[PDB]
Scaffold this active site. Structure first.
Site, PDB file in Angstrom:
ATOM      1  CG  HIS A  62      18.930  34.988  24.506  1.00  0.00           C
ATOM      2  ND1 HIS A  62      18.603  36.246  24.011  1.00  0.00           N
ATOM      3  CD2 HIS A  62      18.637  35.011  25.858  1.00  0.00           C
ATOM      4  CE1 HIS A  62      18.052  36.978  24.976  1.00  0.00           C
ATOM      5  NE2 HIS A  62      18.026  36.222  26.111  1.00  0.00           N
ATOM      6  CG  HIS A  92      25.481  27.911  24.407  1.00  0.00           C
ATOM      7  ND1 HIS A  92      26.102  27.841  25.611  1.00  0.00           N
ATOM      8  CD2 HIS A  92      26.065  28.914  23.681  1.00  0.00           C
ATOM      9  CE1 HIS A  92      27.037  28.797  25.644  1.00  0.00           C
ATOM     10  NE2 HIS A  92      27.050  29.488  24.474  1.00  0.00           N
ATOM     11  CG  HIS A  94      27.027  31.819  20.007  1.00  0.00           C
ATOM     12  ND1 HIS A  94      26.384  32.790  20.700  1.00  0.00           N
ATOM     13  CD2 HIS A  94      27.708  31.075  20.962  1.00  0.00           C
ATOM     14  CE1 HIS A  94      26.640  32.682  22.013  1.00  0.00           C
ATOM     15  NE2 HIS A  94      27.449  31.665  22.192  1.00  0.00           N
ATOM     16  CD  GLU A 104      29.328  34.457  20.641  1.00  0.00           C
ATOM     17  OE1 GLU A 104      29.794  33.826  21.641  1.00  0.00           O
ATOM     18  OE2 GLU A 104      28.428  35.325  20.691  1.00  0.00           O
ATOM     19  CG  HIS A 117      30.570  28.947  23.206  1.00  0.00           C
ATOM     20  ND1 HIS A 117      30.014  30.210  23.162  1.00  0.00           N
ATOM     21  CD2 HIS A 117      31.684  28.938  22.385  1.00  0.00           C
ATOM     22  CE1 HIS A 117      30.753  30.932  22.336  1.00  0.00           C
ATOM     23  NE2 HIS A 117      31.761  30.216  21.868  1.00  0.00           N
ATOM     24  CB  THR A 196      30.024  35.815  24.094  1.00  0.00           C
ATOM     25  OG1 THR A 196      29.131  34.721  24.031  1.00  0.00           O
ATOM     26  CG2 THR A 196      31.471  35.367  24.068  1.00  0.00           C
ATOM     27  CB  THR A 197      25.096  36.158  26.491  1.00  0.00           C
ATOM     28  OG1 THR A 197      25.483  35.156  27.485  1.00  0.00           O
ATOM     29  CG2 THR A 197      25.055  35.481  25.117  1.00  0.00           C
TER      30      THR A 197
HETATM   31  N1  5DU Z   1      27.627  31.837  24.804  1.00  0.00           N
HETATM   32  S1  5DU Z   1      28.370  32.085  26.389  1.00  0.00           S
HETATM   33  O1  5DU Z   1      29.754  31.428  26.242  1.00  0.00           O
HETATM   34  O2  5DU Z   1      28.680  33.588  26.392  1.00  0.00           O
HETATM   35  C1  5DU Z   1      27.409  31.488  27.813  1.00  0.00           C
HETATM   36  C2  5DU Z   1      28.208  31.152  28.913  1.00  0.00           C
HETATM   37  F1  5DU Z   1      29.549  31.289  29.056  1.00  0.00           F
HETATM   38  C3  5DU Z   1      27.618  30.653  30.020  1.00  0.00           C
HETATM   39  F2  5DU Z   1      28.295  30.315  31.123  1.00  0.00           F
HETATM   40  C4  5DU Z   1      26.276  30.486  30.081  1.00  0.00           C
HETATM   41  S2  5DU Z   1      25.397  29.988  31.466  1.00  0.00           S
HETATM   42  C5  5DU Z   1      25.928  28.449  31.187  1.00  0.00           C
HETATM   43  C6  5DU Z   1      25.111  27.822  32.355  1.00  0.00           C
HETATM   44  O3  5DU Z   1      23.693  27.812  32.203  1.00  0.00           O
HETATM   45  C7  5DU Z   1      25.545  30.719  28.940  1.00  0.00           C
HETATM   46  F3  5DU Z   1      24.211  30.506  29.081  1.00  0.00           F
HETATM   47  C8  5DU Z   1      26.041  31.263  27.781  1.00  0.00           C
HETATM   48  N2  5DU Z   1      25.282  31.648  26.644  1.00  0.00           N
HETATM   49  C9  5DU Z   1      23.840  31.271  26.527  1.00  0.00           C
HETATM   50  C10 5DU Z   1      22.860  32.037  27.458  1.00  0.00           C
HETATM   51  C11 5DU Z   1      22.410  33.305  26.703  1.00  0.00           C
HETATM   52  C12 5DU Z   1      22.795  32.963  25.286  1.00  0.00           C
HETATM   53  C13 5DU Z   1      22.480  33.703  24.118  1.00  0.00           C
HETATM   54  C14 5DU Z   1      22.980  33.278  22.846  1.00  0.00           C
HETATM   55  C15 5DU Z   1      23.680  32.067  22.799  1.00  0.00           C
HETATM   56  C16 5DU Z   1      23.995  31.376  24.031  1.00  0.00           C
HETATM   57  C17 5DU Z   1      23.522  31.813  25.202  1.00  0.00           C
END
Ligand code: 5DU
Length: 258
Positions: A62, A92, A94, A104, A117, A196-197
């Site tokens: 993702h 990570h 977006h 986002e 983020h 957000t996922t």
């Molecule tokens: N983007 S997020 O703020 O909603 C998010 C989190 F708040 C998280 F806490 C986590 S888990 C962090 C610990 O491994 C995320 F993976 C993600 N997002 C990752 C995991 C899935 C995904 C898909 C697209 C971009 C990023 C991500």
């Protein structure tokens, strides 16, 4: 038929597997800057990344995650709107297919090219998995990216991406200093929201910095060469991995400034 950002499993479908997608404190949101209330009770954010220990960078299909060893009191976020200490677990981004979208959160409907983020969990819950079950379990520091001058402290991330092109790939990633991704000012907006996922859990205090960082076109172009597919599968460029703004519902966004 799992969730994603493609033509038939994207944000508009997520509610079927994850019904809180239509909940009362979903993220992201549009930040209406005129309506956000200055709160003189908000404290400066304390970002203490002096001892951060990155370990590994991962293509999770993702986005990519830069992971930190969170087994000691090292890289922590506190102050601001927070009660207590939150420990950095990963960051990570977006981003979009074009410079005109990718964030986002939006600011008076403005989309940025990308959004970083930095994810932190509340140490009162012992680890991340228990923290995400709590309404104050996570604090996510969000930073906008605009395209302009290169961000030097980003380049070590960009240069490793060729080694993690496809889903499931990881690479050692030690000694990466997330301080090099911060903008000058720690002025922020804050509100209660969600991941957000999927699973879209309503566990996040969002802290979104007002000042965007600049990255170069070349840096963001390299994000856009990543792939959502695994090795040996047809190419699906990793672009447009953002959820659109959700209803604010019964929430107030607070500003630390002005
Ligand atoms: N983007 S997020 O703020 O909603 C998010 C989190 F708040 C998280 F806490 C986590 S888990 C962090 C610990 O491994 C995320 F993976 C993600 N997002 C990752 C995991 C899935 C995904 C898909 C697209 C971009 C990023 C991500």
């Amino acid at each position: 038929h799992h969730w994603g950002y493609g033509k038939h499993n994207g944000p508009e479908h997520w509610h079927k597997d994850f019904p809180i997608a239509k909940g009362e404190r979903q993220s992201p949101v549009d930040i209406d800057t005129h309506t956000a209330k200055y709160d003189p009770s908000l404290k400066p954010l304390s970002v203490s990344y002096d001892q951060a220990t990155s370990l590994r960078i991962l293509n999770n299909g993702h986005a990519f995650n830069v992971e930190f060893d969170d087994s000691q009191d090292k890289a922590v976020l506190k102050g601001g709107p927070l009660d207590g200490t939150y420990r950095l677990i990963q960051f990570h981004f977006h981003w979009g297919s074009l410079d005109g979208q990718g964030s986002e959160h939006t600011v008076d409907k403005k989309k940025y090219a990308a959004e970083l983020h930095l994810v932190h969990w509340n140490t009162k819950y012992g680890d991340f998995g228990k923290a995400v079950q709590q309404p104050d379990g996570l604090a996510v520091l969000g930073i906008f990216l605009k395209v302009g001058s290169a961000k030097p402290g980003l380049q070590k991330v960009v240069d490793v991406l060729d080694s993690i092109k496809t889903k499931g790939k990881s690479a050692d990633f030690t000694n990466f200093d997330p301080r090099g991704l911060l903008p000058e000012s720690l002025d922020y907006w804050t509100y209660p929201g969600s991941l957000t996922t999927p699973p879209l859990l309503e566990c996040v205090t969002w802290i979104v910095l007002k000042e965007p960082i600049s990255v170069s076109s070349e840096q963001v172009l390299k994000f856009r060469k990543l792939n959502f597919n695994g090795e040996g599968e047809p190419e699906e460029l990793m672009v447009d991995n953002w959820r659109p703004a959700q209803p604010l519902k019964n929430r107030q966004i607070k500003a630390s400034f002005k």
